[PDB]
A paper describes a structure:
Following increased insights into the importance of vRNPs, antiviral drugs that target nucleoprotein (NP) are an attractive strategy as NP is a highly conserved multifunctional protein that plays an essential role in infection by all subtypes of IAVs during the virus infection life cycle. NP was reported to interact with RNA and oligomerize by self-interaction to form an oligomer to maintain the structure of RNP. In addition, NP is essential for viral transcription and replication; the major role of NP is the encapsidation of RNA into an RNP complex and maintenance of the conformation of the RNA template in a suitable order for transcription, replication, and assembly into virions. Furthermore, NP or RNPs participate in translocation between the cytoplasm and nucleus with the help of other viral proteins and host factors.
Here, we characterized a novel influenza A virus nucleoprotein (NP) inhibitor, FA-6005, that inhibited a broad spectrum of human pandemic and seasonal influenza A and B viruses in vitro and protects mice against lethal influenza A virus challenge. To obtain structural insights into the interaction between NP and FA-6005, FA-6005 was cocrystallized with NP, and the complex structure was determined. The NP/FA-6005 complex crystal belongs to space group C2221, with only one NP trimer in each asymmetric unit. Three FA-6005 molecules were found in each trimer. One was in the I41 pocket, and the major interactions involved in the I41 pocket included (i) hydrophobic interactions of the t-butyl group with G288, V285, and A286, ring C with I41, and ring D with G54 and R55; (ii) hydrogen bonding between amide O2 and T45; and (iii) dipole-dipole interactions of ring D with D51 and S283. The second one was in the Y289 pocket, and the interactions involved in the Y289 pocket included hydrophobic interactions of the t-butyl group and ring A with Y289, R305, and L306 and rings A and B with N309. The third one was around N224. However, N224 might not be a real pocket since the compound is seated between two symmetry-related NP molecules. We found that in the presence of FA-6005, mutation of residues in the I41 pocket displayed high resistance, while that of residues in the Y289 pocket exhibited more tolerance to the compound. FA-6005 would bind on the external surface of the NP, and thus, it may not interfere with the interaction between NPs during oligomerization.
Numbering used by the authors:
A (entry chain C): 21 to 77, 88 to 396, 403 to 429, 438 to 480, 485 to 490
B (entry chain A): 21 to 72, 90 to 395, 403 to 429, 438 to 489
C (entry chain B): 22 to 72, 89 to 395, 403 to 428, 438 to 490
The structure:
């Protein structure tokens, strides 16, 4: 049954790979051009665009920039395709299945890339949220209705942001909560509360989300409750899925080598993506301004959903220093329409790493003794568990402040868990780091 | 007069030592065997048992390169007689009590008492309050000093329930004497509390005519309060008999020299003594060692950080401790049994306290531009700004886990006999972890 | 900015030159010139000269293997003269003030001042607020920067009480000039507060036309508040004159080279200078050393763990400190008096602050299953009309274990330009590392 999942993920990767190969054939891209991440992005965006039901209710066409190697120089062409031609090729590549999962996979890869490329300081202040809540904004770029995969991967902040957005619409325009489809806007609000509720790993945070969901007329008080909850999630962190989702060319490349993902199985959270990246070859266009090592770090972080991970941890796994966004001499992977193709060079993206680690959906949340009884006449504090003991007596906000105050930045999580060698396939022999400088953005 | 007490406890220790030597001679134990802590336990249990027609238990011998367990038997009368002879014809209640309290300290450090707590309607996380829960219900004044707030609540809950179920418990000639016992226990509990409010609530519970469900609820509330407004509980370093016996066999004169259960003396005695333990296949000797050390100093429910600092080695939580306890069961396999030196020494010593915590500087003014917290004494400063449960919740809510207690008090060097130069522990380079259980 | 270094340089030059001239006039040996007791006397002679029309004090001499304490006398005019010559005819008020602050720092580190505090209706536990309480009431701008909130409050209470006793203090032509003194002092206090609330309450006090018992109460409240919402108080490393004297004699050119009271300069100067001290028979030289070190760097009220870290040896509480103070009283026995080198060096340096403490990512979201702590910025996150009430609210909110000076580190003594901060890792649960109590 573990292997049933590996086979289905395997099948999904296969599909994306096949589709990528087919798209390279139709565009008559060389093997070199096919491994250009910029070309991967365009091909990806085209297929997603082709299925965007929302958007598609010519403008019956899709496209974007394709890049070509023309005597060792890079030339940008803008191409155009029929959404129904691309939808047709996608289904053929996926054996007639509609392969929603594969579409969602590529979405989640874009999201991870967005989370690693753009601080969302603008979006946060315009919502009345604190711009320092950016570690909470995983998946803030995904479409509002996404997979179950879409929801697993969204951050607590993303979910709060979406709920705030709705509450505000309702305050400005007092007809948002009404109409014939008022009942379905209401269920949408409750649905999002429950998603949020399910990310929280304490009774008190879960109870506060119940209060918010159950709110008759959601307004300014619920705004305030949600801001408080988002703040709390900076310390009592929510469970957020982390999925290593790679550009389509990498899967395409591997399928073209005769790699059989379905037979072999595949996991977004185990060794597989690390192994696949150890042996794949991806190029990127790169601006004269830009350090290739920095471009490389960007994609690496995106590939493993690591924007908001401790740079210490990221560095240790990677074997190269993973550097803060403020020290990073690169602007991001897509190339604008106004950029001059003539001074554009290209390098190999370093996407490998020293070790691997499993990806978690955990936030790090941890009878028995809850106080000390002093034995020795010695100057010190006398520890006790203030959240639990005082819990015996009136607000959710008070319980949560207590827990937040109880938590200490130096509390250790994931006790026993470690990184692994790329030769340690079955994750037998953890290597626990020792650490002495940790946030990507700030 | 300080030195009067030292002499008295010295005389008690002497007696235990002499008794132990005399038992080792009767059993023809080698010096190694005499320092086996399992042997010490049996000998201890025999003498206590003799004062509660035959008595005995497992004695362990090194025979043909192996540890052999034999089961020995003695007349209570013969053991009593040897005890009195060892103690110069005194009855030596105190010496009996001392061994009892050692057993208790060992029990407290070996076994969480989760079972007992839930069966009483008490929360299993109240185990820091359960010191001495294993002692017999009537023991010394020494007995009662050493018993925890939780132990005392548990005893009074047990008695309230007996009175509910059997409505003849509080009535008759029997009921005059059970009543005085209930009051006596309420006073003992009262005397351990260090706030007027907690004391008043114990007065209300005592003064209850017909103690039932309301008093039960008062007592659990009190116990819960004692997790923050902690009670006074005596801590006494009481060592296995073999250690005293060993010392006495060296010509140590406890009566002339004097002894203290709360100053340097047990730490000095442990620096230079040598105890062994049987040890099971899966067991780490350093972990067995930590167990006995904690027991010896009554430190089961102390902050592991404090215990580490004094000891000089990491004192690790019960859940991370590869050992199962010091007595060996009768169905255990003696063939797989090895033995090791218990490491019972320590880097420093500290005075043992009966206190449970709470001019002079009460704040720091930063001088240097350096990353750190800025201490101040929040209890004292905020103190500048009529139902008893409400008063107590107010105090609990005031308190903070990082409030400092025992201001000015610190550990000592083993060469600082007179307790001249306290050293305040810092826990900066130290790794976290406060609760043994 | 290099104009300031040059002017502080010029001031230091002057003190050094003056000290060298005074050592010549007294015919002091190299050794005697570097004796801190002789430095103190020469210092308080010059200060005294600018306060019969004689001045002087104890000068100590190494004569035939014995320390001889002789009393010298001088005309205030002669010493004023020498001072101005040394300072090229400037009247070097700043230099006089520098020495005053050194004596103040030495006072703060030697004496608790519990007497003065009760006699003003202040709490004797307010001693962390009493930096500079020994300075003259008017001492230049340097004087005022260095004075604590408590000192300021104490001086305003002194003035309120003069106004109560003499019910025409506030009144006439002399009542206009006492009024401006009061307002000046209120403004100095106001400027040290880093909250709107505290500042508004100082406005209320200043604007009182007839200050009495209500303003007293307001100022005690404010002093209590500064134990948690701390004032800005300058810290200035001011060394004994003999150190500067020594340095000038070595051909150090403080005016060309520049100098800072808050940067590396005083640490470098002390690292490589050599100061001696008389020491009584029951005194530990290491302890005397600590005292002088703390005074030099104005560290009396600093967290001992911070002082310990910078210094490289344990900086020990005042109660554990075997020394009685640097001056020697007239009835002390010179025959039993020995002398040692003060250990004034340190392992690192740290910038001195005038601060009191208190967008981007402020927390981590774990991506990999890997053992580690989970950083977040606790102070920032947790941070989320009657002035008294506003202040009590903020005092009650504050957490002693909040970190201040985030990112700020110590430096190597080679690191002039403060290039490479080394950030220590203190335990934030620790709120006990006070010099006094
Ligand atoms: C997240 C999904 C798509 C499954 C969803 C779930 C519920 C709803 C909904 O609109 N209404 C609703 C009403 C009550 C609840 N209650 C709980 O979800 C709930 C109540 C108690 C719980 C708990 C969940 O988690 C496990 C233990 O405790 C949930 C949803 C919408 C979407
Ligand atoms: C030590 C003094 C000088 C008081 C002394 C004691 C006993 C004797 C003596 O005549 N007999 C004697 C009998 C027994 C012992 N000791 C033990 O049999 C014995 C005593 C204590 C033991 C032990 C073995 O095992 C290890 C430590 O605990 C020692 C001497 C002579 C001097
Ligand atoms: C600590 C007391 C004095 C209570 C004590 C300790 C151990 C014993 C004991 O049974 N044996 C024992 C063995 C060695 C020693 N002590 C020393 O070897 C010793 C003790 C102190 C010393 C010293 C050596 O030299 C360095 C510092 O001063 C003391 C007792 C008896 C009494």
């Amino acid at each position: 049954n573990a292997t049933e999942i590996r086979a289905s993920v395997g099948k999904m990767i296969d599909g994306i790979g096949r589709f990528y190969i087919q798209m390279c054939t139709e565009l008559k891209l060389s093997d070199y051009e096919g491994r250009l991440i910029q070309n991967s992005l365009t091909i990806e965006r085209m297929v997603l665009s082709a299925f965007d039901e929302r958007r598609n209710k010519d403008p019956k066409k899709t496209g974007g920039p394709i890049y070509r190697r023309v005597d060792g120089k890079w030339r940008r062409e803008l191409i155009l395709y029929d959404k129904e031609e691309i939808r047709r090729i996608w289904r053929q590549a996926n054996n007639g299945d509609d392969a929603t999962a594969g579409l969602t996979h590529m979405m989640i890869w874009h999201s991870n890339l967005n989370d690693a490329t753009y601080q969302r300081t603008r979006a946060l202040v315009r919502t009345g949220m604190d711009p320092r809540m950016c570690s909470l904004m995983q998946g803030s770029t995904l479409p509002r209705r996404s997979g179950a995969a879409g929801a697993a991967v969204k951050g607590v902040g993303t979910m709060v942001m979406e709920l705030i957005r709705m509450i505000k619409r309702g305050i400005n325009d007092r007809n948002f909560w009404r109409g014939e489809n008022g009942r379905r806007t209401r269920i949408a609000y409750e649905r999002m509360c429950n998603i949020l509720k399910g990310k929280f790993q304490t009774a008190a945070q879960r109870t506060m989300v119940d209060q918010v969901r159950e709110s008759r007329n959601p307004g300014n008080a619920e705004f305030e409750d949600l801001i408080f909850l988002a703040r709390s999630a900076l310390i009592l962190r929510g469970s957020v899925a982390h999925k290593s989702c790679l550009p389509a060319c990498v899967y395409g490349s591997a399928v073209a080598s005769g790699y059989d993902f379905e037979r072999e199985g595949y996991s977004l959270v185990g060794i597989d993506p690390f192994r696949l990246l150890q042996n794949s070859q991806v190029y990127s266009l790169i601006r004269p301004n830009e350090n290739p090592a920095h471009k490389s770090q960007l994609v690496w972080m995106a590939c493993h959903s690591a924007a908001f991970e401790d740079l210490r941890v990221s560095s240790f796994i990677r074997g190269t220093k993973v550097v803060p966004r403020g020290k990073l001499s690169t602007r991001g992977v897509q190339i604008a329409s106004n950029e001059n193709m003539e001074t554009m060079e290209s390098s190999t993206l370093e996407l490998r790493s020293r070790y691997w680690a499993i990806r978690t959906r955990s936030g790090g949340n941890t009878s028995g003794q809850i106080s000390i009884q002093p034995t020795f006449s010695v100057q010190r504090n006398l520890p006790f568990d203030r959240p639990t003991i005082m819990a015996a007596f009136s607000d959710m906000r008070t319980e949560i402040i207590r827990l937040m105050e109880s938590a200490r930045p130096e509390d250790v999580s994931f006790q026993g868990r470690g990184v692994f060698e790329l030769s340690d396939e079955k994750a037998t022999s953890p290597i626990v780091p020792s650490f002495d400088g940790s946030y990507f953005f700030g």
